[PDB]
Ligand binder design. Structure first.
Ligand code: CLA
Ligand code: CLA
Ligand code: CLA
Ligand code: CLA
Ligand code: CLA
Ligand code: CLA
Ligand code: CLA
Ligand SMILES: CCCCCCCCCCCCCCCC(=O)OC[C@H](COP(=O)(O)OC[C@@H](O)CO)OC(=O)CCCCCCCCCCCCCCC
Ligand SMILES: CCCCCCCCCCCCCCCC(=O)OC[C@H](COP(=O)(O)OC[C@@H](O)CO)OC(=O)CCCCCCCCCCCCCCC
Ligand SMILES: CCCCCCCCCCCCO[C@H]1O[C@H](CO)[C@@H](O[C@H]2O[C@H](CO)[C@@H](O)[C@H](O)[C@H]2O)[C@H](O)[C@H]1O
Ligand SMILES: CC1=C(C/C=C(\C)CCC[C@H](C)CCC[C@H](C)CCCC(C)C)C(=O)c2ccccc2C1=O
Ligand code: SF4
Ligand code: SF4
Lengths: 80, 62, 95, 141, 742, 41, 34, 163
C-alpha cells in the first residue's frame, strides 16, 4: 500500500504516466501550466514501488513522489 | 517577472542550483501560471537537466 | 477450459480455467481388509485427538529423555564414565 | 464509456511453458488481456517463449497486472494493436481495468478528477517533529 | 558464391578523430559535463555493436582489432626472445641443466634493487624465471644466442607486418559483409591450412632439426661441439649416422613401406630416462598424424566446387520427437551475431586450456621440465586461471547475445525456445543438486572436524576410520595402466607414469613422475570440485536464461544487458541483470580455481615431488601428510597455509623479498576491494558534495563536475580489485615456497 | 599537424609525459645522491 | 558436586525439551489469524 | 516428423507446467495413484498407518549401522530407540502443522476435479479431523514398524548380507 503524491510544480509532460509499468498514474485537466494538465494517482493500490515515474520526471526536484509503505501481495510483485 | 536575458539567483531551497546564477529564457504572462519563469544554467543537475521553472519570488535581481 | 476450441477461459468452469485439478487422486473405496480396519481403528484411534496427542508427546519425551540421561551406564556414555588418567599440570605449574 | 464484458474468444497458438498460472490464480485473482489482430503474427510471450496470435479476437490468461501491461505496451508500440485487460476473482467476479474510461492514461480526458495532488512544492512539507504522536505523515497534509 | 569482395578506400586516414575523444559514440561526442563521461568513454570504446547498426562496419572493426592484438602478441614474443638472448644464462644452463637456475630478467642498481639479482648459477645474477622458455628452446634445438636474436628480429618484423595488415584492411581495402559470412570456406581454410599445414611444418622441423640435436645433447656431446641445424640437411650422412632410416630417402614414404621409418617415428609411452620428458620421436609421429587428420577433415564443407557438406542442411536434418523443430534456425544466429560465436569460442578455449594444464603436468613434454618444480606449478596454475576466466566470459557474452541479438520471430519451436520454456525446472533441479553436493561434501569435512575436536577419531571419514574409496577412479587407473598389454598392444609403456602401473623416473636425484594413489581424501576433494563447479554453472545459467524476463520483471529485455536495478519496489530488485550474474560467477570461479590449485600443490608436494638417494629411497617434500591431514579444515589451515607460508614471510633480506612484498600488497588490495563491494553510491555522492563545497570556498572547483562512481562501476571496481588481490596473494605464496624448496 | 598537437595535449598523454619526466628526474637524483635520510643543509 | 546427577537431567531438558516446546508454541502463535 | 511427445499440462498452454513421460505415464501414474497418499476415498487413519509403518521400518537401518554405539553390544537397541525418537519428533511436527493449517469449520482444500473434468468428493485428509486421524495413525504405524524391524533384525537371527 504505497502512496504516490503529485505536487504543483508539475508541467504535464506525461513522462511519468508513460513510464508506469502498472498503470497507476493518469493525466487530468488542470490550470497552472502551459500544457494545462497535471498527473494524478488514483490506482495507488497497484503501485509496486519501482520509482520509474520519479526517474522520468524533469524538475529541479521531483513533482511526483513515492513513499513506500505497507507491503501487499500486489506490492511485492508475487506471481505465486 | 524578470526580463529576458537577465541574470538571476535561485532562492528555492530544494533546488539544485540554490545560490547559483541563471539566465532567464522566457516568462509566461498567463494569469494562472504558478511557475512562469524559465531559467537556464551552466551545469547539469544529478538527473542531467539544466533548465527549470521558477516563481518570480524565488529569484534575485543579481 | 471449455475445451470445445482454442478457448481455455470459461467463467462457467472456473476450476478448469484456473487449472485446479487432482493429478493422481484416486477415489476407489476398497483398499484394506475389514478385520485390519477393525483392529487399527480400535487401537490406533486413541491418538486421534490432537491436543491430548501434544500433551502425551511432550510428557513422554521429557520422561524418556530424563530417564535415559540419568540412568545410562558408564560403559556407554564417556561423560558419565569420567576421567581415568592422572591430571596434567599447567604451563607455569598451575593446576 | 460502458466497460466491455467477456466472451469465449480463441487463445493464441502457444505450446506451453513453466511460466504460466499457479495456485495463486486458483485461490486469488488472475488477469485476462484481450485484443484483435488483422493477421497471424509471432510475438514474445511475457512469460518466456514465442506464440502466434490468431486473426481476430485473442484472449490470454496472465498471473500479474505487470505482465498484461507489458504485453499490451509491446502490442501497441510494435503491432499498432488496441487491447483491453480485466481482473478475474475465484468466485467469478470480473473487474475491467486498463482503459478505465476508454482513453489511455497518457492522454488527458475530461471527467477525470485529481487524486493525490498537493498544491505546494515538495519543499514546503512539514517536519516529522511537528506531527509527533499523530497519525499524519506530513505528505498527507 | 564464395569469392573475394572488398571496398576501396572506405575510411580516410587522418588524425582529426584522434582529437575528438568520444567520436565513436553519438552521445559521448558532445564532450563531458561530469566525471562520468571519462568512465563511459573508456568503457564503451571497444563495444562496436552498440555504436552502429550495420554488421559490415562491426565485422571490419573486429577484423582490424584482431590484427592489432596479433601485432601485440608478436611484440611480446619478440621481447621474450630478445631478453633471453641478451639478459640470460641460457648457454650455461644448456651446459648444466640440473644445477643452473634459469634467469632472463636483470634489474638495475638504483635504490637497493641489487638484492633481487640472485645467484642462479653460471656466473650470472638475475631473477629466476618460471615461464619454461629454456626448456622449450632446448626442445626446439636452440644452442646459441644468435638464433634467439634472429628470432627476436623476425618477431619484430612480423609485428610490423600485422600492424600494416590491420591498417590496410580497415583504412584501405575493407572486406564486405558477404565475405565474412562464408563460414564453410572459413572452416575449410582454417581447419586445413592453419592447423594441418602448421602441424606438418612443425613435424618437419622436428624430424629435420630437433631429433638429431636433442639426440646428441642426450648422448652427452657438449653444446658447443654439436653441428648446426643446416648441417643435417646439407649432409644427410650425419642424420643417417644418428637415425639410419634417413639413408633410404623418401622411397619408403611413396612405396608405403612406412615401417622403415620406425626408428624416428615411434609409438612409445613414458618419459625419456635422461631428461624426464616425452620422447621426441613420438612427438614427431603425432604432429604428423595430427597434420594428416586435420588435412583430411578440412576437405568436408561445400564451396564453389560442388562437393561437400552444407552446414544449414545438416543442422536442419537432426531433429526428433522430443525437441520439436530441433536445430533449425541456429545457422542464421551463428552467421548473424558475433556474440554467439564469441560465447561458443570462449567456452571451448577455456575448457581446452584447463585440459592443457592437466595433460601438461601428467605428461611433461619438455626436457628437464618435470624436475623443475617451480615451472610445473607455475604453468599449471597460470593456464588453469586463464581457462576459468575464459569460461566465465563465455556466459557473459552469451547473455549479451540473448539480450541484444535474440529475435523471437526466427525462433518459434526450435531448441532455443524450448530451453527458454522449461527453465524453471532446469534451475530448480540444479539448485537441488548444488544443495545436495554442498551438504554431503562440506558437511563431511565439518563432521570430521567435530569428531577430531571431540577426541573420537574412530568416527571420522578417513582411511583408518570409516572409508570412502574412489573405486571408479581406481578401476580407470588400473585399466589405463594395463593398456600396453591388451587394448593398445603396439604401445611400449602406458600413456603416463601417473597411472597405477609403472615405475619411477628420476633425473638428477629428483623424482620426475610417480604413480599417484587415490584414497578417501581424493574422493572428498573431487566431490568438492564437483560442488563448486555445479554452483558456478548454476549462477551463470540462471543469469543467461532469465536475461530477457522473469516473473519478477516481465520486461527485463527493455532495460538492457547492464543495468543496476529496477528500484526498491517489489521488495527490492537489486542485481536482476545478467551482468550481475556474471559478477557473482566471477567470485565463484575464483573460489573453485583456488581450491583446485591448492589441491594440486599439496598433493604434488606430498606424494610425487621429492628427492631420491642411493638404494632408491624416496623422501617427499611434506612427507606424505596429505592422506591424513587434508580430511579436516583445521588440517588444511595448519599443515598447508601455516606451514607452507613460512618461506614467503621469511624472504626479507634475500633475493625472494619481492615475493613477500607482493604478498603483503596483495592482501592489502584484496582488503581494499571490500570498501567498493560493501558500500553504496549515495554516501559517497553526499561526501563528495561536502568536499566540493570545500573546494568551492577557495574558488578552485573543477569545471567537470565530480560524481560518485555508478552502481555498476562500483561493482566492477570491487570485483576487479578483489580478484587481483586474491590471485596475486596466491601467486607470491606459490612462487616463494616452490622456489625455496624446489 | 594541428590535430596531432591537439591529441598530444589530452590528459592521459600529458600525464604520461609529465610522470615519466618526474620519475626519471627522481631516479637520476637517487643515482647520484643515494641513501639520503636527512637533509644535510 | 553435591548432587552430581542433576546436570544429567537438566542439560538434556534445557537442550531438547525446552527448545521443542518453545518453538512449537511460537510457531502456533505466529501462525494464527485471531 | 510431426509426432511429438511433450504436451502442455492437460492441454492448457497457459498453466505452469508440462506433461512429460515422467509426469504422465501409465506405469508412473498407476504407481502414484495407488500410493496411500492419493487414495482419497480411504479413511485417513489407515493411510497414516501404512505410511508410518513403511517409514518407521526404513528408518531403523541407518541409525543402527551408523551411530555412536554401532561397534558396541547394544547397537540394535540404541538404533531402534533413536528411530523411535525421530518418529516421535515427526509426530509432533505433524500435530503442530495440522493445528496451524486447518480449522474445525473449513470444508476442505484438496482439488475436487479430476484431469478429465469429472467432479468428485474432496479429500478429507486436508481437514482438522482428517489430519488429526492421519497423525495418530502415522504415530502408531511408525512405532509398530520400528518394533517389527528391530524384532526381525535382532530378536530373531535372520541372517542378512550386511545386517
Ligand atoms: C544441547 C542438547 C543436546 C543433547 C543433550 C544431545 C544429546 C545427544 N546427542 Mg546431540 N545434537 C545436538 C544437541 C544435543 N544432543 C545438536 C544441537 C545437534 C545438531 C548439530 C546434535 C546432533 C547430533 C547427532 C548428529 C547425533 C547426536 C547424538 C546424541 C546422543 C549421543 C550420546 C549417546 O550415547 O547416544 C545414544 C543415543 C541413543 C541410544 C538414542 C536414545 C534417545 C532417544 C531417541 C530419546 C527419545 C527422543 C524423545 C522422545 C524426543 C523428545 C522431544 C520432545 C546424545 C543423546 C547421536 C545420537 O543420535 O545418538 C548422533 O548421532 N547429536
Ligand atoms: C613485453 C615486452 C617487453 C617487456 C615487458 C620488456 C621489459 C624490460 N626490458 Mg625489454 N625489450 C623488448 C620487449 C620487452 N621488454 C623488445 C621487443 C626489445 C627489442 C627491441 C627489448 C630490448 C631491451 C633492451 C635493449 C633493454 C631492455 C630492458 C628491459 C627492462 C627495463 C626496461 C625499462 O625500464 O626501460 C624491462 C624488464 C633493459 C634491461 O633489461 O636492462 C638491464 C635493456 O637494456 N629491453
Ligand atoms: C613441411 C614439412 C617438411 C619439409 C619442408 C621437408 C623438407 C625436406 N625433407 Mg623432409 N620430412 C618431413 C617433413 C618435411 N621435410 C616429415 C614429416 C618426414 C617424416 C615422414 C620427413 C622425412 C624426410 C626424409 C626421410 C628425407 C627428407 C628430406 C627432405 C629434404 C629434401 C626434400 C628437404 C629439406 C630428404 C633429405 O635430404 O634429408 C635431409 C630425405 O632423405 N625428409
Ligand atoms: C577474446 C575475448 C573477448 C572479447 C573479444 C570481448 C569483447 C567484449 N567484451 Mg568481454 N569478456 C571476456 C572476453 C572477451 N570480451 C571474458 C573472458 C570475460 C570474463 C571476465 C569478459 C567479460 C566482459 C564484461 C562484463 C563485459 C564485456 C564487454 C565486452 C565488449 C566491450 C568491452 C570493452 O568495452 O572494453 C573496455 C575495457 C576495459 C574497461 C578495461 C578493463 C580491464 C566487447 C564486445 C562489455 C559489454 O559487452 O558491454 C555490452 C561488458 O560489460 N566483457
Ligand atoms: C609518506 C611516505 C614516504 C616518505 C615521507 C618517504 C621518505 C623517504 N623515502 Mg620512501 N618510500 C615510500 C614512502 C615514503 N618515503 C613508499 C611507499 C615506498 C615504496 C614504493 C618507498 C620507497 C623508498 C625507497 C626505495 C627509497 C626511499 C627513500 C626515501 C628518502 C628520500 C630520499 C631523498 O631525499 O630523495 C632526494 C630527492 C629530493 C630532495 C627531491 C628534490 C625535488 C626538487 C628538485 C627540489 C627542489 C626519504 C627518507 C630513499 C632513501 O634514501 O631512503 C633512506 C630510497 O632509496 N623510499
Ligand atoms: C543467567 C544465569 C545462569 C546461567 C547462564 C546458567 C548456566 C548454566 N547452568 Mg545454571 N543456575 C542458575 C543460573 C544460571 N545458570 C541459578 C540461579 C541456579 C539456581 C537455581 C542454577 C542452577 C543450575 C543447576 C542445578 C544446573 C545448572 C546448569 C547450567 C548449565 C546448563 C544449562 C542448564 O541446565 O540450565 C538449567 C537452569 C536452571 C535449572 C535455572 C536457571 C535460572 C534461570 C532460568 C536463569 C534465567 C535466564 C535468563 C535471565 C532468562 C532470559 C533469557 C534471555 C549452564 C552452564 C546445569 C549444569 O551444571 O550443567 C553442567 C545444572 O544441572 N544451573
Ligand atoms: C545409510 C542408509 C541405510 C542403511 C545403513 C540401511 C541399512 C539396512 N537396511 Mg535399509 N533402506 C534405506 C537406507 C539404509 N538402509 C533406504 C533409503 C531405503 C528405502 C526406503 C531402505 C529400505 C530398506 C528395506 C525395505 C529393508 C532395509 C533393510 C535394511 C537392513 C538389512 C539390509 C540394514 C540394517 C531390511 C531390513 O531391515 O530387514 C530386516 C529391509 O527389509 N532397508
Ligand atoms: C612510420 C609509420 C607511419 C606513421 C604515421 C604516418 C602518417 C602519414 C600521414 C597520415 C595522414 C594521411 C592523410 C593526410 C591528410 C590529413 O591527414 O588530413 C588533411 C589535412 C589538410 O590540412 P590543411 O590545413 O593542409 O588543408 C585544409 C584544407 O581545407 C585546405 O587545404 O591535414 C593534413 O594534410 C596533415 C597531414 C599529416 C597529419 C599528421 C602529421 C604528423 C604525422 C606524424 C606524427 C609523428 C611524428 C614523429 C616524428 C619523429
Ligand atoms: C536422458 C534424456 C534423453 O534421452 O535426452 C535425449 C532426447 C533426444 O530427443 P530427440 O531424439 O527428439 O532429439 C532429436 C534431436 O533434437 C537431436 O539433435 O532429448 C531429450 O530428452 C531432451 C532433453 C532432456 C534432458 C533431461 C535431463
Ligand atoms: C622445401 C625445401 C626447403 C629447403 C630447400 C633447400 C634444400 C637443401 C637440401 C636438399 C639436398 C639434399 O642433400 C642430400 O643429397 C645431396 C645430393 O642431392 C647430397 O650431396 C652430396 O652429393 C652431391 C652431389 O649430388 C655433392 O655435391 C655433395 O658434396 C654431397 O654432400 C647431400 O649429402 C644429401 O644431404
Ligand atoms: C570509494 C567509493 C567511491 C568513491 C571513489 C571515487 C570517486 C573514485 C576516485 C578515483 C580516482 C582517485 C580519481 C582521480 C582523479 C584524477 C584522475 C586525478 C588526477 C591528478 C593526479 C592524481 C594524477 C564511489 O564513488 C563508489 C560508488 C559506488 C560504490 C562504491 C563506491 C566506493 O566505494
Ligand atoms: S513507483 Fe512504479 S508503479 Fe508506482 S507510480 Fe511510480 S512508476 Fe508506477
Ligand atoms: S539499493 Fe541500489 S541497486 Fe538496490 S534498488 Fe536501491 S538503488 Fe537499486
Amino acid at each position: 500500500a504505497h502512496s504516490v503524491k503529485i505536487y504543483d510544480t508539475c508541467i504535464g509532460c506525461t513522462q511519468c504516466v508513460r513510464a508506469c509499468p502498472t498503470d497507476v498514474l493518469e493525466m487530468v485537466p488542470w490550470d497552472g501550466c502551459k500544457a494545462s494538465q497535471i498527473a494524478s494517482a488514483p490506482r495507488t493500490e497497484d503501485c509496486v514501488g519501482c520509482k520509474r515515474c520519479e526517474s522520468a520526471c524533469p524538475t529541479d526536484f521531483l513533482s511526483v513522489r513515492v513513499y513506500l509503505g505497507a507491503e501487499t501481495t500486489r506490492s511485492m510483485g508475487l506471481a505465486y | 517577472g524578470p526580463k529576458r536575458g537577465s541574470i538571476v539567483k535561485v532562492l528555492r531551497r530544494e533546488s539544485y542550483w540554490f545560490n547559483d546564477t541563471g539566465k532567464v529564457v522566457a516568462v509566461d504572462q498567463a494569469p494562472g501560471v504558478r511557475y512562469p519563469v524559465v531559467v537556464r544554467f551552466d551545469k547539469v543537475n544529478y538527473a542531467g537537466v539544466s533548465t527549470n521553472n521558477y516563481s518570480p519570488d524565488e529569484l534575485e535581481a543579481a | 477450459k471449455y475445451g470445445e476450441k482454442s478457448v481455455y477461459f470459461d467463467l462457467g468452469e472456473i476450476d478448469n480455467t484456473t487449472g485446479n485439478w487432482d493429478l493422481y487422486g484416486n477415489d476407489d473405496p476398497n483398499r484394506y481388509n475389514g478385520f485390519q480396519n477393525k483392529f487399527f481403528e480400535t487401537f490406533a484411534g486413541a491418538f486421534t485427538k490432537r491436543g491430548l496427542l501434544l500433551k502425551f508427546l511432550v510428557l513422554g519425551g521429557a520422561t524418556t529423555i530424563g530417564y535415559l540421561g540419568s540412568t545410562s551406564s558408564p560403559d556407554l556414555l564417556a561423560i558419565k564414565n569420567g576421567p581415568k588418567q592422572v591430571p596434567v599440570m599447567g604451563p607455569r605449574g598451575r593446576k | 464509456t460502458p466497460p466491455t464484458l467477456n466472451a469465449d474468444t480463441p487463445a493464441p497458438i502457444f505450446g506451453g511453458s513453466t511460466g504460466g498460472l499457479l495456485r495463486k490464480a486458483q485461490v486469488e485473482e488472475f488477469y485476462v488481456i484481450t485484443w484483435e489482430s488483422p493477421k497471424e503474427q509471432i510475438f514474445e510471450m511475457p512469460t518466456g517463449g514465442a506464440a502466434i496470435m490468431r486473426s481476430g479476437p485473442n484472449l490470454l490468461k496472465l498471473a500479474r497486472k505487470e505482465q498484461c501491461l507489458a504485453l499490451g505496451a509491446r502490442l501497441r508500440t510494435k503491432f499498432k494493436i488496441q487491447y483491453q485487460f480485466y481482473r478475474v476473482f475465484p468466485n467469478g467476479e470480473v473487474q475491467y481495468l486498463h482503459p478505465k474510461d476508454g482513453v489511455y492514461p497518457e492522454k488527458v480526458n475530461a471527467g477525470r478528477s485529481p487524486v493525490g495532488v498537493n498544491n505546494r512544492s515538495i519543499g514546503k512539507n512539514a517536519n516529522p517533529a511537528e506531527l509527533k504522536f499523530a497519525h499524519k505523515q506530513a505528505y498527507d497534509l | 558464391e564464395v569469392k573475394i569482395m572488398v571496398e576501396k578506400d572506405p575510411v580516410k586516414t587522418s588524425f582529426e578523430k584522434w582529437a575528438k575523444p568520444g567520436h565513436f559514440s553519438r552521445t559521448l561526442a558532445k564532450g563531458p559535463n561530469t566525471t562520468t563521461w571519462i568512465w563511459n568513454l573508456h568503457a564503451d570504446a571497444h563495444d562496436f555493436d552498440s555504436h552502429t547498426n550495420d554488421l559490415e562496419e562491426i565485422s571490419r572493426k573486429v577484423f582490424s582489432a584482431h590484427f592489432g592484438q596479433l601485432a601485440v602478441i608478436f611484440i611480446w614474443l619478440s621481447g621474450m626472445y630478445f631478453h633471453g638472448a641478451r639478459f640470460s644464462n641460457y648457454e650455461a644452463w644448456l651446459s648444466d641443466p640440473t644445477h643452473i637456475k634459469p634467469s632472463a630478467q636483470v634489474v638495475w642498481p638504483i635504490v637497493g634493487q641489487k638484492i633481487l639479482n640472485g645467484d642462479v648459477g653460471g656466473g650470472f645474477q638475475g631473477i629466476q624465471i618460471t615461464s619454461g622458455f629454456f626448456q622449450l628452446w632446448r626442445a626446439s634445438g636452440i644452442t646459441s644466442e644468435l638464433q634467439l636474436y634472429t628470432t627476436a628480429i623476425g618477431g619484430l618484423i612480423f609485428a610490423a607486418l600485422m600492424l600494416f595488415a590491420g591498417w590496410f584492411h580497415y583504412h584501405k581495402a575493407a572486406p564486405k559483409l558477404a565475405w565474412f559470412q562464408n563460414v564453410e570456406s572459413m572452416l575449410n581454410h582454417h581447419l586445413a591450412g592453419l592447423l594441418g599445414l602448421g602441424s606438418l611444418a612443425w613435424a618437419g622441423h622436428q624430424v629435420h632439426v630437433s631429433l638429431p640435436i636433442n639426440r646428441l645433447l642426450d648422448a652427452g656431446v657438449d653444446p658447443k661441439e654439436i653441428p648446426l641445424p643446416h648441417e643435417f640437411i646439407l649432409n644427410r650422412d650425419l642424420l643417417a649416422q644418428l637415425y639410419p632410416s634417413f639413408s633410404k630417402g623418401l622411397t619408403p614414404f611413396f612405396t608405403l613401406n612406412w615401417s622403415e621409418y620406425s626408428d624416428f617415428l615411434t609409438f612409445r609411452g613414458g618419459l625419456n630416462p635422461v631428461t624426464g620428458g616425452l620422447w621426441l620421436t613420438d612427438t614427431a609421429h603425432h604432429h604428423l598424424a595430427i597434420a594428416v587428420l586435420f588435412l583430411v577433415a578440412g576437405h568436408m564443407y561445400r564451396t564453389n566446387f560442388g562437393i561437400g557438406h552444407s552446414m544449414k542442411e545438416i543442422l536442419e536434418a537432426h531433429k526428433g520427437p522430443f525437441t520439436g523443430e530441433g536445430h533449425k534456425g541456429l545457422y542464421e544466429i551463428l552467421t548473424t551475431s558475433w556474440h554467439a560465436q564469441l560465447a561458443i569460442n570462449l567456452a571451448m578455449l577455456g575448457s581446452l586450456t584447463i585440459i592443457v594444464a592437466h595433460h601438461m603436468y601428467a605428461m611433461p613434454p619438455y626436457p628437464y621440465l618435470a624436475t623443475d618444480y617451480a615451472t610445473q606449478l607455475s604453468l599449471f596454475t597460470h593456464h588453469m586461471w586463464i581457462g576459468g576466466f575464459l569460461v566465465v566470459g563465455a556466459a557473459a557474452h552469451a547473455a549479451i547475445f540473448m539480450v541484444r541479438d535474440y529475435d523471437p520471430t526466427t525462433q518459434y519451436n526450435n531448441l532455443l525456445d524450448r530451453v527458454l520454456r522449461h527453465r524453471d525446472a532446469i534451475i530448480s533441479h540444479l539448485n537441488w543438486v548444488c544443495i545436495f553436493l554442498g551438504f554431503h561434501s562440506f558437511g563431511l569435512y565439518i563432521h570430521n572436524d567435530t569428531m577430531s575436536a571431540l577426541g573420537r577419531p574412530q568416527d571420522m571419514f578417513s582411511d583408518t576410520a570409516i572409508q570412502l574409496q574412489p573405486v571408479f577412479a581406481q578401476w580407470i587407473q588400473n585399466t589405463h595402466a594395463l593398456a600396453p598389454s591388451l587394448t593398445a598392444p603396439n604401445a611400449t609403456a602406458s600413456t603416463s607414469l601417473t597411472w597405477g602401473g609403472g615405475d619411477l623416473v628420476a633425473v638428477g636425484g629428483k623424482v620426475a613422475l610417480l604413480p599417484i594413489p587415490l584414497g578417501t581424501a581424493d574422493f572428498l576433494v573431487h566431490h568438492i570440485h564437483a560442488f563448486t563447479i555445479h554452483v558456478t554453472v548454476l549462477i551463470l545459467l540462471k543469469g543467461v536464461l532469465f536475461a530477457r524476463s522473469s516473473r519478477l520483471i516481465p520486461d527485463k529485455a527493455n532495460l538492457g544487458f547492464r543495468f543496476p536495478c529496477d528500484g526498491p519496489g517489489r521488495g527490492g530488485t537489486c542485481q536482476v541483470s545478467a551482468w550481475d550474474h556474471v559478477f557473482l560467477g566471477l567470485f565463484w570461479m575464483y573460489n573453485a580455481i583456488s581450491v583446485v590449485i591448492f589441491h594440486f600443490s599439496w598433493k604434488m608436494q606430498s606424494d610425487v615431488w621429492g628427492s631420491i638417494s642411493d638404494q632408491g629411497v624416496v623422501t617427499h617434500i611434506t612427507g606424505g601428510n596429505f592422506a591424513q591431514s587434508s580430511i579436516t579444515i583445521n588440517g588444511w589451515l595448519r599443515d598447508f597455509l601455516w606451514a607452507q607460508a613460512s618461506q614467503v614471510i621469511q624472504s626479507y633480506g634475500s633475493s625472494l623479498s619481492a615475493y613477500g612484498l607482493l604478498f603483503l600488497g596483495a592482501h592489502f588490495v584484496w582488503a581494499f576491494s571490500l570498501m567498493f563491494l560493501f558500500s553504496g553510491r549515495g554516501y559517497w555522492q553526499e561526501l563528495i558534495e561536502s568536499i566540493v563545497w570545500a573546494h568551492n570556498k577557495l574558488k578552485v572547483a573543477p569545471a567537470i563536475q565530480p560524481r560518485a562512481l555508478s552502481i555498476v562501476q562500483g561493482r566492477a571496481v570491487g570485483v576487479a580489485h578483489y580478484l587481483l588481490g586474491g590471485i596475486a596473494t596466491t601467486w607470491a605464496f606459490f612462487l616463494a615456497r616452490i622456489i625455496s624448496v624446489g | 599537424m594541428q590535430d596531432v598537437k591537439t591529441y598530444l595535449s589530452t590528459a592521459p598523454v600529458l600525464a604520461t609525459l609529465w610522470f615519466g619526466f618526474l620519475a626519471g628526474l627522481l631516479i637520476e637524483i637517487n643515482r647520484f645522491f643515494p641513501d639520503a635520510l636527512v637533509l644535510p643543509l | 558436586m553435591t548432587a552430581s546427577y542433576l546436570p544429567s537431567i537438566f542439560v538434556p531438558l534445557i537442550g531438547l525439551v525446552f527448545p521443542a516446546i518453545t518453538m512449537a508454541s511460537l510457531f502456533i502463535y505466529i501462525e494464527q489469524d485471531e | 516428423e510431426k509426432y511429438q511427445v511433450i504436451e502442455p499440462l492437460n492441454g492448457d498452454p497457459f498453466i505452469g507446467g508440462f506433461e512429460t513421460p515422467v509426469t504422465s505415464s501409465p506405469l508412473i501414474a498407476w504407481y502414484l495413484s495407488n500410493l496411500p497418499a492419493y487414495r482419497t476415498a480411504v479413511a485417513p487413519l489407515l493411510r497414516g498407518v501404512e505410511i508410518g509403518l513403511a517409514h518407521g521400518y526404513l528408518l531403523v537401518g541407518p541409525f543402527v549401522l551408523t551411530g555412536p554405539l554401532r561397534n558396541s553390544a547394544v547397537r540394535g537397541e540404541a538404533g531402534s530407540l533413536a528411530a523411535a525418537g525421530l518418529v516421535t519428533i515427526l509426530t509432533m511436527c505433524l500435530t503442530i502443522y495440522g493445528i496451524a493449517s486447518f480449522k474445525e469449520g473449513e470444508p476442505s482444500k484438496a482439488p475436487s476435479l479430476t484431469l478429465t473434468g469429472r467432479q468428485k468428493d474432496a479429500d478429507k485428509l486436508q481437514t482438522a479431523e482428517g489430519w488429526a486421524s492421519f497423525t495418530g495413525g502415522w504415530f502408531f504405524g511408525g512405532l509398530s514398524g520400528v518394533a517389527w524391524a528391530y524384532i526381525l533384525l535382532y530378536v530373531l537371527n535372520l541372517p542378512y548380507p550386511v545386517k
